[PDB]
Design a protein around this ligand. Structure first.
Ligand SMILES: O=C(O)[C@@H]1C=C(O)[C@@H](O)[C@H](O)C1
Ligand SMILES: O=C(O)[C@@H]1C=C(O)[C@@H](O)[C@H](O)C1
Ligand SMILES: O=C(O)[C@@H]1C=C(O)[C@@H](O)[C@H](O)C1
Ligand SMILES: O=C(O)[C@@H]1C=C(O)[C@@H](O)[C@H](O)C1
Ligand SMILES: O=C(O)[C@@H]1C=C(O)[C@@H](O)[C@H](O)C1
Ligand SMILES: O=C(O)[C@@H]1C=C(O)[C@@H](O)[C@H](O)C1
Ligand SMILES: O=C(O)[C@@H]1C=C(O)[C@@H](O)[C@H](O)C1
Ligand SMILES: O=C(O)[C@@H]1C=C(O)[C@@H](O)[C@H](O)C1
Ligand SMILES: O=C(O)[C@@H]1C=C(O)[C@@H](O)[C@H](O)C1
Ligand SMILES: O=C(O)[C@@H]1C=C(O)[C@@H](O)[C@H](O)C1
Ligand SMILES: O=C(O)[C@@H]1C=C(O)[C@@H](O)[C@H](O)C1
Ligand SMILES: O=C(O)[C@@H]1C=C(O)[C@@H](O)[C@H](O)C1
Lengths: 149, 149, 149, 149, 149, 149, 149, 149, 149, 149, 149, 149
């Protein structure tokens, strides 16, 4: 599916509802709403749209991936903590044959504790952006636009 | 309990809703409904019944195992990705003193990525079947039948 | 906040709803209701109160930490199996800048299987109590009463 | 080849000659002869026959695997200790392009010492059954019947 | 024995003679004499008494555990660096069939360097308290009073 | 430093001279010259310029990083193989106090051999982009323009 | 059980046929026949006898263990290289419910390459003697004499 | 010894009897008889002769190594699966003080599964040839011919 | 020195003063006094004598090794827990050029927890006896008698 | 390319300029000039020629590999210490689609320190020769001639 | 404290009493009295004095470190075996806020056995000298002189 | 060679050209020219001279080591990053039979990141100084004076 025919799904993992309010020295002062506005504006320059959601539940993220599999033109995901722990989210992305996927981490996870250096999502994601702040979501939208188109 | 007095609980973990539709070269073309039918038939030959369920949610699965503990004669479980990650599911099964438990994986997890090699559920499960396709749920039900006697 | 102005949050993870009914040789014969009343009594001696809650869902536990972050004077948490697996809960606790946190394990996890030896919550909790039975929750309450003062 | 045209090879590794006589609390009280009768009955239901053998010698199992490659419709194997140590049996199975293979462990190896958790044979076997008692051989035979048709 | 018939032994390992004077940002500004008074006060509320000691010698701590084995109603020990290195102290504790033992760490060792994550003593202690400051000794004494009854 | 005042240094590691001519199924069919023209246009859209270079020599890349430290407004680097092996290139980037740095890998290294999973450069780079093909370079340029702004 | 009723089985692993002729600086200059005479005289001092055997074949050693299980009063075994690799010989000795077993190594394996530091036989052997030369076989016969009486 | 006075022992391990017939994409379509004729021809060009043998049995291989020790001018060995597992064949080779030994693998073991990467025989062999197909056997003969001379 | 000219030093590590009194299911019911009487009798049969000591202090053990280096004909040591942790005791035995040394463990350490499998002493000991009960000391005496001759 | 159309590139890594002068007990007394002569002679027997070079610089070896890719019929390489550390030389050889490549080590690396046991080059090289001395270079030339022919 | 006002504590761990007498091929033929004279001399050239001590006992070492903390200008320590095992001695040094500490090893521990590779003291010592013979004590003293300055 | 007949080679690895200008809080504010003057002065007191160089290039350092091998009295080397990565420079130094080598690290590498803990150079260097600042190079010069004397 192309960007003209279906939205880009933009998924956000656990604790991201507090972006811009908690640990600003690590994740910045922009909020999740500010990030949704960036995404909308980047997709509109390519003639696309976005479906932007956040959840703290692993299984709800699994369900939204299944939805995107049939209805969306690609997926930009910041799995947050679940990057490091969820084989179930990996597996949900693996049922999405050929759908473009870009993983995004606001912080540079390779500079932080060793438990954050590995992500299960990365083994499926076509592209992985880390430590580019909320600008990384925009890079994700632009990479989907290049892959879908 | 016996098979005549209570149903066998058949539990299915994340992504199993898309069985037969996704990655058929790994997991085959039979659907979850097809699997449910195989189970009903095998339990019937032993004078028993099944209670077949699927969920994406780790905590829902926990809840269902608590229910089984009191109302079912045994559990046949395919924990899917949660086999590799859920200490919480293992611990739910450990509350079920003496209840027969059979773990089933459709694919042969020992030929796949190393993160798939280990299951938490397997330390509590009485029996473990892997790589026997959807026929391994039939083996599951048969083994519950033998043990519930 | 202070103990006079807001309740202490007391959070229990998965399977702890069965406390006193299952595996009494490991976890004792006192119920979760029994624990709650111990907590209510200990907080009352310091002029405080408690908000006592259990869940089998990782994401609901995250949401209740976020609620504590704004409305409670500290957290006493028994993550149960999530202690071992949940980076998400650790991250939720991390968003709570300066809020006193005390982790509690009923059993001595250090004498159990090696997968129980490490907890994600312990890198954030101020204090960790293990193997002091349900009396560890009273210790927890007593320590938050000291830290809040 | 088919079950009607050639027998199913049933191979048993070292120490299995003492089945039913030794360590009954781990492996049961049914003998190797009892297992052979279970196998003969299971295959006859599908119009097939079995060739059941046991050896303490690694090279003799490799020789038998080579024979089956030419004359048998599939192989049901309990390699016993050899599971954990024999790259030479794994390799013999690897020469049998397309022959159905099912590996059987009477006990649940995943609940035992860590040196028993890994099996060389499992990387080639199509299916792997563990902890289903001697009933696991019957599973084996039924799985070959499905694959050889 | 019982708290009315024998004292609780309170043992302190190496460098705790400088408590209050060195590294106050990690271990606080209360002294070992201050901790002794808190212990004395807690035990007297249960009609008990304490026998409070410190040593920088591994062999001396071993000899004091032998003494406790015969003359004391239980042991509250803060092994200090010996927690991480001393199989001999673990083994002395192991000779004390059934005597209640609570291990205390002033600091939350789980947040410090990885060599401080493991403790030998923890596999024998009944209970372990970490990161609750000098108040953990009062928790120790309370636990021993509950067990000794 | 501003984009107006000095060029962005774009550094490419060993073997990138052959880009578009070798292993096109992993690294694409665009040439290194093609990447250089993408970079010049990306920087131009922010009023900036680029200094694009490639080398098979680890010490030469070290020397170019020192040069950048004094004369450039940031560094986009694709270390190629040296990402995995060069402590010396990490240390050269460590000399560059506060200079924006973005590391780019054409291919998604996290899907490839395990020796490619770790990069010494990622511990210093502000941002890391992998698996976005040659478009990653454009992202790299954009992030430097936003960090230099 | 008694030395009077049945001989002590003395089993020697692979390459022990060459003892005294190969690598004398590691294993000495006494031959295997010289060891057999030592073992005859040691057993004679207790009123017993020996049945002394050597094989390069893992399976043959398994079959002699099963023989011993029924007809001998204990086993002294030097598994030679099979100590480090044979799960099969371990398993054969585990079928020997209560039979006294002593493992002997001529050389001190703990001083040699790391692959020699672990023995599978040592988890079943009641006693293990290493680096006492051919005199270790006399020790083994004395230990069996003490265990049988 | 010399090539004019004694034959070169050429030994082949388990499954090599099927060379040319099984997994031809890995090991080639030349048979073990074709290999023997290559070896005869190479040895004759140096005035020498070969003694070519194959076996699936580890113990037999050990026995043949013992024969060579006394009767042959060197050993070219393809230990096949027993390269990875047999400490016993290593130790047989170690009894052969000074005898030239060359280990040959038809496939390039270093490109295959990690369990194939280590050979116990490589620590004693003088030279090791891998991935040169059946010509590697000719290289082994030529090397034995330079070392005997 | 010889057995006629100097005694055999027999050193016992921490907690062995309680032998016969604590953990009799693991270490037996004979006391340290009974073990010294065994040693005296065994030494006397070879015309030697013994100097039998025990300490809980690692440094004292070091001092007594030093003393043996000058005044005794060999050392039999049971290092007890310091087996596992004392590089200092290893190093004291390394200063003893050529002095016979035999290490003895009453229990079969290879069947106990993984922290007990490694001994620093065994890389220096000429011989190592484990799991032969108190009889292990007599085998120690006998080995020093053969080595000092 | 055929051997008649283009030379075989023979590449030598760091420190091989001193071959025959340093550590002769490890690498022999033939020089690098001696080695080139051997190669010229072996190539000439197959109607071919060689291009023999040596370099201490990783980048220069990468550049020469690039040259060979276009102008040579195959490569024989002794990467010397770069075997163990150069991902960059491995990737240079990966750009050479279908070019025959044989890695040569003069010493038997597998007998040396464990850092020398793994080579990055070996995952790409078609054939690997180790411990055949400078004769291994002739084997390399011979293999190239067979693969180009 | 300055060198003029207080002596430099020179500390020596276990077995060092035998320096010059034992293992001279590793540690040399100079004695501990020789090393003290070298320290006195080097301190004298800076107007300083030394307090040179040796002990086999870990806790004595800790006690002397506490004395230095209050009465000495700095510590030069050779912890000997306790380097590898003593967290207690590292924690003693860590109580000495800002006191200059230099760790010395006579032998180059990095060329020896792997258990010697790691030092606990090294994480706190300001400088670490290894393999420079007894001259490394002189280096110690000189460094203390520069840092107390 | 003596210090009177030949200069001491002082080699400095990558990034050292910015000593004193970069990361002064780790490496100090003295420049490389200041270090060379300290070495010239130390050598002059022994009647010797220095030959002080720096390079970013691994192979140029190998070349310089080859020079020193024939023309210099010894080598003082700060390999810098290449300490951790270069088996090539290790090997270069291994060609220098009997030449005194001292390795120096300005900063205390044991307190930094774990990839800095190991040095390949340290397995050949006679002595190793770390964390003594730039005064460590004077220690180096002094140690070569003693060894060449
Ligand atoms: O950088 C991110 O956005 C990530 C967000 C989190 O919540 C962490 O758990 C991840 O580790 C990193
Ligand atoms: O084979 C199965 O049924 C399993 C199904 C999945 O969903 C995976 O997550 C498991 O790894 C395996
Ligand atoms: O002791 C406790 O309360 C913990 C309770 C749980 O449920 C386990 O999962 C933890 O491992 C231990
Ligand atoms: O359970 C089985 O049948 C196996 C039987 C054996 O003998 C063991 O060695 C295996 O580990 C397990
Ligand atoms: O926190 C405590 O009381 C401990 C005190 C010590 O001295 C350290 O050795 C331990 O690691 C921690
Ligand atoms: O993907 C890239 O651009 C990098 C390209 C290289 O050359 C490889 O060496 C790296 O592993 C990946
Ligand atoms: O010491 C012995 O008797 C042993 C003899 C062998 O043959 C070795 O394989 C063992 O490793 C040790
Ligand atoms: O390459 C060969 O000749 C080898 C052949 C065998 O049979 C294997 O088991 C080895 O792993 C490789
Ligand atoms: O078996 C013995 O004598 C040993 C005695 C001890 O005290 C233990 O610490 C050892 O682990 C074993
Ligand atoms: O054997 C040789 O040719 C190799 C040559 C080198 O220089 C070493 O670095 C390698 O490790 C071995
Ligand atoms: O080199 C030194 O001075 C050391 C001396 C000791 O006694 C050893 O224990 C150390 O490992 C090293
Ligand atoms: O401390 C030194 O001088 C070292 C200097 C370097 O450049 C680092 O790379 C080394 O890790 C440390």
């Amino acid at each position: 599916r192309s960007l003209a025919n279906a939205p880009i799904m933009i998924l956000n993992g656990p604790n991201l509802n507090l972006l811009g309010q908690a640990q600003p020295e690590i994740y910045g002062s922009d909020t999740l709403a500010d990030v949704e506005a960036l995404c909308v504006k980047a997709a509109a320059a390519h003639g696309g749209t976005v479906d932007f959601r956040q959840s703290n539940h692993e299984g709800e993220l699994v369900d939204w991936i299944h939805e995107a599999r049939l209805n969306h033109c690609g997926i930009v995901i910041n799995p947050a903590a679940y990057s490091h722990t969820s084989v179930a989210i990996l597996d949900a992305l693996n049922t999405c044959d050929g759908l473009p996927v870009v993983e995004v981490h606001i912080s540079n996870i390779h500079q932080r504790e060793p438990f954050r250096h590995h992500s299960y999502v990365s083994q499926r994601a076509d592209g992985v952006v880390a430590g580019c702040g909320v600008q990384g979501y925009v890079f994700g939208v632009e990479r989907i636009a290049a892959l879908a188109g």
